[PDB]
Ligand binder design. Structure first.
Ligand SMILES: CNc1ccccc1C(=O)O[C@H]1[C@@H](O)[C@H](n2cnc3c(=O)[nH]c(N)nc32)O[C@@H]1COP(=O)(O)OP(=O)(O)OP(=O)(O)O
Ligand SMILES: Nc1nc2c(ncn2[C@@H]2O[C@H](COP(=O)(O)OP(=O)(O)OP(O)(O)=S)[C@@H](O)[C@H]2O)c(=O)[nH]1
Ligand SMILES: C=C[C@@]1(C)CC(=O)[C@]2(O)[C@@]3(C)[C@@H](O)CCC(C)(C)[C@@H]3[C@H](O)[C@H](OC(C)=O)[C@@]2(C)O1
Ligand SMILES: [Cl-]
Ligand SMILES: [Mg+2]
Ligand SMILES: [Mn+2]
Ligand SMILES: [Mn+2]
Lengths: 330, 189, 189
């Protein structure tokens, strides 16, 4: 039997990261992906420095010396084919070391900054080696936007899976429709953590709210009245951290969180902070209200608290899915 | 259940022939609106004959444009020569009803070979049609064609076993699409 | 076949579709596109079965373009004219519905014009219904040169519409092949 799974979700929600996990789990090339990793590293640093002067209030370096490195990073910012000379890494790390720069990083929600920033910046010395080999984790972090539709094929216990990946950004959504017929199930991806961020498309639409409205669009779609949705509440790790950091409150972006108390059937993780539990579930329910209101038992919604970059958490919930595919005779 | 049953079906290895009237407006600036519709009907009546002979399938008629396709209903390896011959017979066909018109009526044959997706769209007033890039391209041969000749693509020449004789149509310079798509056109001699 | 003195012809196309058509292995070769079109058309056809559009006659569909006519159901006086217009708005209201569910942004282009037309059938093998005349391509050209979400109508057409309680803006001039330069107007909503 073959089950064609479609991956839908906003931008950077983590769609490509799951398809990656599928090759990790059920399926010399790493050479070409080193470049893309470095490209990430570059964007990460150059973006944070850029934001320093534009944030309000602006952000001052803790070491005036670094200004020159700041001037450096900017000068090579739009360079076409960058050589990634040895100095670059030095100037890069230097800045990262700079406390003021990190202060700016903490306010990265106030500007568009790729996820893998901190991760990669923290291994400049590793990535700079010319004998450098990307770990599976690094590849999981390597962010590269997807434009168009990509189909991946795998097999699990001789059960065939045809997974479809697409672009999450608004301009891409117009290609989705080409996979709405004969689809088996929809795996809707959500970037739980991005409750304090806005999308790139206008830098004004809240990212979480964008996911909601988008989910609503798929749920209540005139051609998905029967299709059940496997809702992945991803980037749990980022969410938890954010919640525990206490810096930016959820009730400030979604005031309805103030009225919220945690559910009964709530099953927390071993030693999971009640605030984290209370939050991730608040988030989940927001998506359930959307599915509950309509559908008429024609199709169903299956939540999942996930972390795509985590091959273990993913091997876990994916099985939770293989079941529902079989168990529901889908 | 989700989408209306689509009465569509793919079809590989076929030949798509388009044909329009060289300067139809000049033609209409002379004869009565009725006489045109009659000359038209007259022609295509003769056309539909040649079609069923040349193993073709008339698809639809849009004023002065006639487009049938060999390779249907049933697949035929001879699908290319059919359209060609069809073009041939069409060439003379139009030439003979030019006698009745007493005016410069002429055609412009364009044929590209490939694959289509045919059926019918919507729910009401069904009309058989064909759909594909090759089908768009065939249409552009008819456009970037040459009056009185047969404008075949390099694909239509490869299913032809070159039993016919071609020559640079240079259609790339006679039509934007053919140029923008690096298309080597020819013309049956 | 007979002729008429006043039929309101309308052409409505979706330019944005030709680009949208993609023949990739993923979408089964533009099939899924044709499937999305089949819906669009099917949707427009559903309008015909209404109470106020009970006088509209879908004639045929060419490419992504919808071709209907009003006033053929006859041997205040030009109500079918404003009706053909009301049908344009219908098509659009229906097109912006699809977009909502296809995460797309399709836009219709309209061309409405009237005048005598020669109705009847052409094609000998399987005959098909179609209307002819200058009245026709003029409305056609009103579309091929119209603007997105705008109905381009000839001046005669304009005049009446106003008497019918419509406002119109003079687009300016247009070179209608064979008919020289004409002065079109846009139906302001
Ligand atoms: C004064 N004109 C006419 C009087 C009686 C019958 C027809 C006409 C007439 O010239 O109609 C045109 C369309 O309505 C009509 N036509 C096109 N498609 C359709 C169609 O789908 N249905 C009907 N009924 N008519 C159509 O055929 C004609 C072709 O228009 P094109 O813009 O395609 O010009 P061309 O084919 O490229 O020739 P040209 O002068 O460069 O060389
Ligand atoms: N911290 C953390 N990062 C994650 C998680 N899931 C994915 N990411 C990171 O998110 C970034 C974007 O992931 P990606 O899979 O490209 O998003 P996408 O939905 O595919 O978005 P697009 O590429 O169509 S615009 C990557 O750097 C990836 O490593 C998670 O659970 N936690
Ligand atoms: C529907 C999609 C697409 C791309 C596919 C195609 O092969 C066409 O339908 C043909 C060429 C093709 O079906 C033969 C008829 C005709 C009338 C010549 C069509 C139009 O030119 C269409 O353009 C329009 C107006 O959509 C076009 C080009 O559109
Ligand atoms: Cl998201
Ligand atoms: Mg992607
Ligand atoms: Mn012509
Ligand atoms: Mn024509």
């Amino acid at each position: 039997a073959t089950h064609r799974l479609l991956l839908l979700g906003a931008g950077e929600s983590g769609k490509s990261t799951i398809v990656k996990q599928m090759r990790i789990l059920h399926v010399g090339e790493k050479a070409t992906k080193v470049q893309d990793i470095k490209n990430n590293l570059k964007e990460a640093i150059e973006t944070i420095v850029a934001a320093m002067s534009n944030l309000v209030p602006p952000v001052e370096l803790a070491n005036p010396e670094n200004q020159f490195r700041v001037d450096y990073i900017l000068s090579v910012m739009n360079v076409p084919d960058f050589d990634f000379p040895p100095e670059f890494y030095e100037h890069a790390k230097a800045l990262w070391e700079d406390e003021g720069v990190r202060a700016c990083y903490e306010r990265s929600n106030e500007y568009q900054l790729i996820d893998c920033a901190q991760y990669f910046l923290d291994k400049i010395d590793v990535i700079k080696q010319d004998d450098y080999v990307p770990s599976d984790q690094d590849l999981l972090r390597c962010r590269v936007l997807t434009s168009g539709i990509f189909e991946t094929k795998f097999q699990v216990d001789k059960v065939n899976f045809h997974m479809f990946d697409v672009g999450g950004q608004r301009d891409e959504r117009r290609k989705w429709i080409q996979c709405f017929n004969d689809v088996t199930a929809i795996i809707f991806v959500v970037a739980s953590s991005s409750y304090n961020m806005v999308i790139r498309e206008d830098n004004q639409t809240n990212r979480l709210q964008e996911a909601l409205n988008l989910f609503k669009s798929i749920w209540n779609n005139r051609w998905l009245r029967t299709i059940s949705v496997i809702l992945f509440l991803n980037k749990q790790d980022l969410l938890a951290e954010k919640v525990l950091a206490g810096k930016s409150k959820i009730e400030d972006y979604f005031p309805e969180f103030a009225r919220y108390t945690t559910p009964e059937d709530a099953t927390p993780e071993p030693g999971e902070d009640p605030r984290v539990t209370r939050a991730k579930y608040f988030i989940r329910d927001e998506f359930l209200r959307i599915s509950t209101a309509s559908g008429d038992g024609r199709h169903y919604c299956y939540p999942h608290f996930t972390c795509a970059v985590d091959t273990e958490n993913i091997r876990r919930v994916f099985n939770d899915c293989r079941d529902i595919i079989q168990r529901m005779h889908l | 259940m989700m989408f209306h049953k689509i009465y569509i079906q793919k079809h590989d290895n076929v030949s798509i022939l388009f044909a329009d009237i060289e300067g139809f407006t000049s033609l209409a600036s002379q004869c009565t609106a009725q006489e045109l519709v009659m000359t038209l009907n007259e022609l295509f009546a003769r056309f539909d004959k040649l079609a069923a002979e040349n193993h073709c399938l008339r698809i639809k008629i849009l004023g002065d444009c006639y487009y049938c396709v060999s390779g249907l209903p049933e697949a035929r390896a001879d699908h290319a020569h059919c359209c060609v011959e069809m073009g041939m017979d069409m060439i003379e066909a139009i030439s003979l009803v030019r006698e009745m018109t007493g005016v410069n009526v002429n055609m412009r044959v364009g044929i590209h070979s490939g694959r289509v997706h045919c059926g019918v769209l919507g729910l009401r007033k069904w009309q058989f049609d064909v759909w594909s890039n090759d089908v768009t391209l065939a249409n552009h041969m008819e456009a970037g064609g040459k009056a009185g000749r047969i404008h075949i693509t390099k694909a239509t020449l490869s299913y032809l076993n070159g039993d016919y004789e071609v020559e640079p149509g240079c259609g790339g310079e006679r039509n934007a699409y053919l140029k923008e798509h690096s298309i080597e056109t020819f013309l049956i001699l | 076949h007979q002729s008429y003195d006043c039929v309101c012809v309308m052409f409505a196309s979706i330019p944005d579709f030709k680009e949208f058509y993609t023949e990739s292995d993923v979408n089964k070769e533009g099939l899924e596109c044709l499937r999305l079109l089949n819906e669009i058309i099917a949707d427009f056809d559903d309008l015909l079965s209404k109470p106020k559009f009970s006088g509209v006659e879908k004639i045929k569909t060419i490419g992504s373009t919808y071709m209907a006519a009003t006033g053929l159901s006859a041997i205040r006086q030009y109500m079918h004219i404003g009706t053909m217009v009301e049908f344009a708005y219908a098509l659009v209201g229906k097109l912006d519905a699809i977009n909502k569910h296809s995460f797309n942004d399709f836009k219709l282009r309209v061309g409405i014009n009237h005048g005598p037309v020669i109705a009847g059938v052409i094609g000998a093998q399987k005959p098909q219904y179609d209307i002819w005349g200058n009245t026709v391509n003029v409305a056609s050209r009103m579309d091929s040169t119209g603007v997105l979400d705008k109905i381009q109508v000839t001046e005669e057409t304009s005049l009446i519409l106003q008497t019918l309680g419509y406002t119109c803006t003079c687009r300016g001039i247009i070179n209608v092949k064979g008919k020289g330069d004409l002065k079109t107007y846009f139906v302001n909503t």
